[PDB]
Design a protein around this ligand. Structure first.
Ligand code: NA
Lengths: 462, 459, 456
């Protein structure tokens, strides 16, 4: 049975970076070399300030940077020496041509497959670590077979990531499961056991699932679709709660206490964000349309349509409450990241709520404690930003003479604000639109102050 | 009970201007103060040259300008007045949710917030302009949120019904006076107070008291019923051209029914003005917002038929010209949306022109009252310079033209010398009567050599 | 009755047709006129268009009875027969944009003919005109009538770009349409006697004016319908395992169907097929015949489906990513042995691949270098398009080779050399069925070859 001793990982993003640091930290006898085409990333890993901030990552990196964990821009030498080659390059959504906005672009994987087969001889294991479309490993095998050399035996496996932005180290040291997919051939099983033996240094065998290559690629996309479907389902219930008088937090709790359903991912919101949910669902839909499966495509498309409906419905309540005219009205936008405790604004619901209010000619005063000022201006552009957008340094400056306060990100600080002071300098009637259910428990207090507070999944009183 | 002695009207623009002059003319004991944020308008009212030209308006203004009629101090006028009129224009939104249909309440938002600021005690607030339904709820919401001790503001609805041309006559002898207020003992007091103002010259039978919502809805529905009659008879005109019937004969037979009436049955190329399409499209948007799609698509047919009437007329011209109008000279006679005016807002001549401009035609436009600069603005978004020429007289527009198009029912177009026109027109020469003004000259024009076609008559 | 001795032709289609008339009618004076001075001077020089055997025909009569002039007024006044051979382009604006024909060049001729003419003359429309257009010409003549002024006929062309002289000397049929009046029959027999100098009487068909205008449009629609029909079968062969060339041969051996115009391809091109079919569809919509309109629209929809389907196969074989990939496009004209690229299927296959961010290396032995850049524009052309001076240069480091025109030279290329400098895997997409017979050889070399109407 083959044993893996030297590992190369193409791509030093949030995928291959943290994953390989844990491998070097739990397998001291294995030499792990993380490479990337960006020289600025390599210098950032070798600097006392890492490019990505994960809790407990500094302790893991500095414990191995020098012994068995190395970062370099010399990709050819790392590929030649390694027994296992990770492909951790980003596969962005296509923005052009057939499949624009849904299909994934494989140009960064095509380059690695052609560069791996170039600077390699003998037996090596090629494993796709990034989120790839289904049957993409067939494309990698096709490049290897067409460009075959004497004494070249490249094995192609699938081992997708499942870590979340915030608990990467905890999810890598104690993962729910490790997914490995390979061909159902004696050569493929040897490569699977080789990679499977690497994780057995700190992962039990029960939490290691071995499937075929296609089941591994499909599981990564479907897992994010199942998670996204839970949010859209509870969001669809929130719209029904607002029309029946029910409360979505009460309904989500009653649903969540069923052990077969679970209580995770049942928090209604203005809409899910991030660079993974909509990206993978839209790719899953494109896959079904390409495979003549229109019933399956329109099934999963409802997850996106529901999420778009949730955002547009929330913005319409704000405009309808403001007498269907928001021209030259000051609106405070509290929160711009797609979730709390981060500065990432990729596919954030605050972008769409802002643009919906910008289409009414509103004067938005946006505040977010961690999102940089330049990111807000870029996400709200294609001229229009300079006329309507103002970025406040604190919440109270954004609510100085504002008609309404809109909460789009569940930052904990918004719960502890002095709403007595805010109401004094707000125009009347003063509105609060809680798009994250963070003020649950302050409704009676905020109404006695003078606020008309509306929130997702609760019928408005009077 | 309560008596109104001092009146303020925010907005001096065709609506509140003439209405308050008549109130001051029939109520010498009531002080009427018209205010506006634009100083140029106020100085125009106090000058011997008024900003708007209505017949008999100078006689009413000069009789009261100084005694009880006054025209820029909005804060003091609100504090002293018992009744406050809101006569600000509410334009159609050109952006956001409801673009092209919904109305923008930003000019009413300012008045409601400025009233509640410079006001104490008991005052009556009455909306005079064309507002969307439930707009008074928005004014009440601002008053309730910004309430002061010993502040009792009453909100009423009193829409206008005057037309551009007979404003003074429609105010002295109105068909009806609409006043809407809440069905509460406090609201009824304010309604009777406003009713008592019109009783100085309007009989009580012609003063109707309804709720606030019925008054807002009646103003929109009244213009839709009028527009529906024109679109209905226009749909018949298209049917007459296919059966051989005549639309003027059918409209007469329909009009002699006492239950139907004979008013607003004149078939045309399409109705114009800033009130018909604006109020119908706003009515359709209201129904969609209230989950009433059946009602929305019902009233949308008034607009679709009017758009069909214009596009159908333009297609007849192109098909008669062998489906090619590139570099062809066409005389466009009439540009206003109706006769005896210079207003070209939503005029059917604009759409017929643009339909012919999309074929690369050389249009020579003439209108006796529409200014030359107004035609160039209405035909823009380049394209106007290459194709549009404005003639000072009809004959200059018909010098080497293939066809003559009549889009406005000007009386002078009936008396033109068509014998001279045909001699310098390219052959074959066409005449397209889009207003049924040549009824009676069909046999004469055909003997001259013209092929005359008109709305609601088989060729 | 009347005999035609002097011929005027507005528009230098009309060039080759009148040169043959002057070559077979030495006693008839043929004068070709045009408003463009550049064309007329080109005809009198040692020609603007290249047709086989045309130089021999022109030089045999240029001076005796064949003349080219820019003086249109004098030729109309003197001629007994006046041909209207002006182009009627598709409208790009207004009512009927993209489908209807523009009659401005016919309107101008009708008003200029009726101006510089007196007495009896025969007016014949030679170009492809819409139906009932002759009714419009009669209306202009009746409106601008002079004393002692008296005929409108239809005589459409049927020559193809490449065999004009052979199709004019030995035509399949001569179509002449005129009114069902004693005056119209005189004008028809007058025009009939001109073709009887070298065309038998059996191959001369006399119909009414409207049947003659519709026959020209319908004939191109029936021809286009046969290509779309065999193309729809080609898509079905790729899914069943059948072969379209075998099915087309088995169908073609039926005497009632015929074997002509049954070669499946990436899509038909030219300035006549789609132009006349789209105009035929617009005519039906204008006459409240939507069932007939959507019937003939399927010929266009199938042709667009054939092009888009072929372009999609190329991208899917290339792993659904063609960004910064070198692709060789062999052939740009709509057919072989020509340089015309009007409505060529190579334009759409290229633009489909350009929308994926591909680096196209185009080669065509006869299409000019500047024409390819124009057909691919409205900055995008400069970044993605490269024009190769010879083959192999387009396949130097290319991922796939696409054949869009049935040039005979593409069959005789050295594919062994091409594969050595191509990136692997190397693909060949035969969009014209020119490599039928080399499939086993190309696969042993290392190529994965795919073609229209054959299952992979
Ligand atoms: Na395509």
């Amino acid at each position: 049975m083959f044993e893996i001793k030297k590992i190369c990982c193409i791509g030093a993003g949030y995928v291959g970076g943290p994953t390989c640091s844990v491998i070097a930290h739990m397998c001291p006898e294995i030499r792990v070399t993380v490479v990337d085409v960006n020289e600025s990333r390599i210098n950032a890993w070798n600097s006392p300030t890492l490019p990505i901030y994960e809790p407990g990552l500094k302790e893991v990196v500095e414990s191995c940077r020098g012994k068995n964990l190395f970062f370099s821009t010399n990709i050819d030498d790392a590929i030649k020496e390694a027994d296992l080659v990770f492909i951790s390059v980003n596969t962005p959504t296509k923005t052009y041509g057939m499949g624009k906005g849904r299909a994934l672009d494989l140009k960064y994987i095509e380059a690695c497959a052609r560069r791996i087969v170039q600077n390699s001889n003998g037996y090596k294991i090629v494993t796709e670590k990034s989120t790839v479309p289904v049957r993409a490993a067939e494309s990698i095998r096709r490049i290897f077979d067409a460009n075959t050399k004497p004494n070249l035996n490249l094995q192609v496996l699938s081992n997708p990531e499942f870590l979340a932005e915030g608990t990467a180290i905890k999810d890598l040291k104690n993962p729910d499961r490790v997914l490995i997919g390979g061909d159902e051939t004696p050569e493929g099983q040897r490569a699977v056991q080789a990679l499977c033996a690497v994780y057995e240094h700190w992962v039990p065998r029960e939490k290691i699932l071995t499937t075929n290559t296609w089941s591994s690629e499909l599981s990564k996309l479907a897992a994010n679709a199942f998670l996204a479907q839970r949010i859209s389902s509870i969001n669809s219930i929130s719209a029904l709660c607002e029309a029946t008088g029910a409360d979505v937090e009460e309904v989500a709790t009653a649903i969540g206490m069923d052990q077969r359903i679970g209580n995770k991912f049942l928090k209604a919101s203005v809409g899910f964000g991030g660079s993974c949910f909509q990206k993978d669902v839209l790719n899953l839909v494109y896959l079904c349309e390409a495979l003549n499966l229109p019933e399956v495509a329109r099934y999963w498309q409802q997850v996106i349509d529901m999420n778009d409906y949730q955002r547009r419905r929330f913005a319409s309540r704000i405009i309808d409450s403001l007498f269907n005219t928001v021209t030259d009205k000051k609106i405070a936008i509290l929160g711009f990241a797609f979730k709390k405790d981060t500065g990432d604004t990729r596919e954030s619901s605050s972008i769409y709520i802002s643009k919906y209010l910008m289409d009414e000619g509103a004067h938005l005063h946006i505040y977010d404690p961690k999102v940089p000022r330049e990111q807000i201006v870029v996400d709200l552009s294609h001229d229009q930003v300079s006329r309507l957008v103002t970025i406040s340094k604190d919440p109270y400056e954004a609510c100085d003479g504002a008609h309404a306060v809109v909460i789009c990100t569940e930052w904990d600080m918004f719960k502890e604000l002095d709403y007595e002071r805010i109401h004094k300098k707000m125009l009347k009637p003063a509105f609060i639109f809680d798009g994250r259910r963070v003020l649950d428990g302050l409704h009676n207090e905020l109404q006695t102050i003078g606020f008309q507070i509306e929130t997702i999944g609760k019928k408005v009183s009077s």
